[PDB]
Write a protein that binds this ligand. Structure first.
Ligand SMILES: CC(C)=CCC/C(C)=C/CC/C(C)=C/CONC(=O)CP(=O)(O)O
Ligand SMILES: O=S(=O)(O)C[C@H](O)CNC1CCCCC1
Ligand SMILES: O=S(=O)(O)C[C@H](O)CNC1CCCCC1
Ligand SMILES: O=S(=O)(O)C[C@H](O)CNC1CCCCC1
Ligand SMILES: [Zn+2]
Lengths: 4, 486, 318
């Protein structure tokens, strides 16, 4: 879930 | 409504041809084609009138997805430490998904959401990924926190919106501290510069009535120069000095950054500044968007960039960008002087057949078969599913009706710009800006008769708004609060 | 077993600060004892704005447990600059992070800040490191973005020689030889050959580029990357499509590369983007009805996933  | 949206089950599935030239890309592609097509083969065609015997039923397992989101909502295992700086996103993914699934939180739980997020708000401006005593503010948690407050908050003393209104000047000052002269923003102090930050900042500034000319200077140029030769948008553009002599995109067109770029640009088109925003190539963006929808053998899901794999989260990033690209293309056609632009049926089939967790397990939606579901893919699969189910367009007559009802005499205090001449020239110009920005933010409609609910009406989820990605029934009272409209 | 930091002599003077979640927070994470302890003391360190070696060590401990912790990375870089630490030693640590799987938007940005501050007169060793790092994942988006930034930043300083640019194109050509479907390497070629400010634009270079593009299409006729590059190339340089049509027409069923006379095996025809090329070339010739016919076939027969888009393009012809 790495969007930041 | 389906003449030009053929079901995946109605088309011939065939592998991407090799041309007798093997490569690592093709090995992964073929393996993924096998995985998805085998699951479709095991699943009853959702368009069939009576569900077939032995096959899996593809109906949207709304209660399983609710339970998936509930269990992670009140306690996360220690492994989620890797998302400790992303907890506002965990909130947003959860509460937007529940909105889409039509599941209400009780007031006590909503109050817990509001209180958790307000503890992430720094007095100097902005939300961080965790409590203000532990994390500095960051543009991305600020978007996720603000949107989550739109979903879970209210106008009362415990509703969070009042605190947001009081934070407008400090949030604005945080945004201005993030601003680079070339039109990019750092995501946080010392942080990276890309269109994720631009998108998150512009959404929040639009919703909270804190847009100024000085905030926006060169922001359009930074985004426009992110467009690549493929027609999508890269993460960032690089400014070469002579202000800059030229700007160059820094990587591939990607669904995530194309979503942020289209949405940012769209938000800027509401702003009444001269020769602003610098144009993009809307036709090339529309072409890139539709080219990323996968073939029937890969379930009609979207990929995020050329020659990579389909992934359910791009139902939102790429699928949700389609109405925006379509509207920008419509505007250019009208400036020079209706069939669906992507396969709305196939995208729903991908969501129902491939992106749901296998039945009777943990629930949740996922990137693709073989991947564990998580909150992020649950939210983005459902957000994209909503865009596929409901024909969203930006309605000039709706914007015109919004302009007719806008009350420019109501509003919160104007922001005080950081530079003396950085605000609007006068109240005529500022109020016209407030009217245009508010009226266009509320311009998205679901087209009557445009609904396509693959698999029957029990699969229907609520309508999300393009650009913002919250339900219209959340967006309207939220932005009305901050602009003092009613 | 674990030794709490309240029991450490080096830390005995620091009163930890608890996380300020409020009464009953949503999405709470059940932190390990080690992580909670380190963050309790980081909160104390950061609140007092201590810039020290123990604070530096603490930030490493935290980003090893959570590489995405942007606040701690920000503090770590401010420590490095405050303490005048060896940024070359820090780069060596960052090589290991990506090696020990520790990666993120923050690790990559930290590396960029290091390179910006070191400001090497010659960034060749970093260029070579980045090339090597692409072996496990040759499409890693942050890495390709970082490589673009590195060449762009150091070329603005005048520090990229003609030899360096030439070896970079050699490296890019080898990447596309190993996997011509690597769209990230196609994007890099576009920077090297077209978009970067120092790129040569001559009659020779346009001819060479078109040869490379067409050779690439004939090697992999269904490679979308090569087709998009061809279309971007022609559009960018305002080159007409018709003069190249001989090399494209065999896929729609002179002096530039033509398809192999027996087309490679596993090349089913028509290639939809070849039809897109043909239709756009009809539009170039104002033969709008011949273009509409090709769009209709893409819609109804040859690219039915995009039936609606191709129908839209058909209607535009009227
Ligand atoms: C509002 C926000 C935070 C938008 C972010 C949207 C996204 C998804 C941006 C993409 C980030 C990115 C390029 C990560 C790189 O690693 N991801 C992949 O490689 C996945 P793929 O193979 O599909 O490209
Ligand atoms: O798939 S979902 O709709 O989200 C939830 C499950 O179907 C629940 N199945 C129950 C089995 C026993 C009888 C009552 C229903
Ligand atoms: O008054 S404000 O500046 O708005 C908020 C306080 O400074 C909180 N600072 C935190 C200290 C620990 C590290 C993360 C930031
Ligand atoms: O409203 S309609 O589209 O005509 C038809 C219904 O929605 C069908 N929903 C199913 C009913 C039986 C249980 C599983 C779902
Ligand atoms: Zn994904």
């Amino acid at each position: 879930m790495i969007i930041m | 409504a389906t003449e030009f949206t053929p079901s995946v089950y109605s088309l011939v599935s065939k592998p991407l041809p090799s041309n007798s030239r093997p490569s690592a890309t093709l090995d992964e592609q073929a393996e993924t084609e096998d995985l998805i097509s085998q699951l479709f083969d095991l699943t009853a065609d959702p368009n069939a009138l009576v569900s077939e015997h032995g096959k899996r039923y593809s109906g949207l397992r709304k209660q399983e997805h609710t339970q998936f989101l509930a269990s992670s909502f009140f306690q996360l295992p220690g492994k989620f430490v890797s998302l400790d700086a992303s907890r506002p996103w965990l909130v947003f993914w959860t509460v937007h998904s529940l909105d889409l699934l039509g599941v209400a939180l009780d007031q006590g739980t909503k109050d817990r959401v509001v209180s958790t997020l307000l503890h992430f708000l720094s007095p100097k401006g902005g939300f961080g990924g965790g409590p203000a005593n532990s994390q500095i503010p960051h543009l991305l948690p600020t978007y996720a926190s603000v949107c989550s407050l739109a979903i879970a908050g209210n106008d009362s003393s415990t509703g969070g919106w009042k605190d947001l209104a009081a934070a407008r000047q400090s949030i604005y000052e945080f945004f201005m501290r993030c601003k680079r002269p070339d039109g990019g923003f750092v995501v946080c102090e010392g942080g990276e510069v890309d269109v994720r930050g631009t998108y998150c900042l512009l959404v929040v500034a639009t919703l909270l009535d804190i847009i100024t000319p000085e905030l926006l200077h060169n922001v359009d140029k930074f985004v426009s120069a992110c467009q690549t030769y493929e027609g999508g948008f890269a993460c960032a553009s690089f400014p070469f000095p002579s202000e800059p002599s030229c700007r160059v995109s820094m990587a591939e067109a990607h669904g995530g950054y194309t979503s942020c770029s289209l949405n940012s640009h769209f938000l800027l088109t509401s702003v009444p500044l001269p020769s602003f925003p610098l144009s993009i190539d809307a036709n090339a963006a529309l072409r890139w968007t539709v080219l990323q929808q996968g073939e029937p053998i890969e379930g009609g899901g979207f990929r995020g960039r050329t020659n990579k794999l389909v992934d359910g989260c791009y139902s939102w990033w790429v699928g949700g960008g389609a109405p925006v690209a379509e509207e920008l293309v419509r505007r250019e056609k009208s400036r020079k002087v209706i069939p669906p632009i992507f396969n709305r049926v196939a995208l729903q089939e991908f969501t129902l057949v491939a992106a749901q967790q296998d039945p009777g397990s943990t629930g949740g939606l996922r990137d693709k078969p073989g991947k564990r579901p998580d909150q992020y893919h649950t939210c983005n699969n459902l957000s994209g599913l909503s865009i596929a189910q409901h024909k969203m367009s930006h309605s000039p007559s709706t914007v015109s009706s919004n302009r007719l009802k806008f009350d420019a005499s109501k509003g919160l205090p104007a922001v005080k710009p950081v530079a003396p001449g950085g605000g609007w020239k006068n109240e005529d110009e500022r109020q016209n800006a407030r009217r245009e920005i508010w009226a266009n933010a509320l311009g998205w409609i679901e087209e009557e008769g445009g609904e396509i609910i693959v698999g029957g009406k029990d699969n229907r989820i609520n309508t999300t708004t393009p650009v913002f990605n919250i339900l219209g029934l959340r967006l309207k009272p939220f932005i009305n609060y901050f602009y003092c409209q009613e | 077993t674990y030794i709490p930091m309240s029991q450490r002599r080096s830390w005995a003077d620091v009163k930890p600060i608890m996380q300020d979640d409020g009464p009953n927070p949503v999405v709470p994470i059940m932190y390990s004892e080690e992580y909670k302890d380190a963050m309790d003391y980081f909160r104390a360190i950061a609140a007092k704005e201590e810039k020290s070696e123990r604070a530096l060590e603490l930030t490493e401990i935290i980003v090893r447990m959570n590489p995405a912790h942007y606040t701690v990375w920000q503090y770590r870089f401010s420590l490095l600059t405050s303490l005048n630490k060896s940024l070359e030693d820090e780069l060596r640590l960052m090589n290991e992070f990506a090696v020990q799987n520790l990666k993120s938007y923050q690790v990559w940005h930290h590396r960029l800040l290091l390179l910006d501050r070191i400001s090497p007169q010659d960034p060749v060793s970093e260029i070579e490191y980045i090339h090597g790092s692409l072996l496990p994942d040759p499409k890693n988006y942050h890495t390709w973005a970082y490589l673009h930034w590195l060449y762009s930043h150091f070329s603005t300083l005048g520090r990229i020689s003609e030899a360096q640019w030439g070896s970079e194109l050699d490296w890019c050509n080898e990447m596309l030889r190993v996997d011509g479907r690597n769209n990230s390497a196609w994007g890099w070629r576009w920077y090297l050959r077209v978009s970067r400010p120092g790129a040569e634009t001559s009659s020779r270079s346009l001819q060479d580029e078109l040869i490379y593009i067409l050779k690439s299409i004939h090697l992999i006729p269904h490679n979308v990357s090569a087709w998009n590059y061809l279309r971007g190339f022609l559009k960018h340089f305002s080159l007409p499509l018709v003069p190249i049509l001989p090399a494209i027409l065999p896929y729609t069923a002179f002096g530039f590369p033509m398809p192999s006379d027996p087309l490679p095996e596993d090349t089913p025809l028509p290639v939809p983007l070849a039809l897109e090329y043909l239709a756009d070339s009809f539009i170039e010739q104002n033969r709008v009805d011949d273009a509409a016919k090709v769009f209709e076939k893409l819609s109804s027969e040859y690219d039915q996933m995009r039936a609606g888009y191709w129908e839209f393009r058909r209607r535009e012809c009227a």
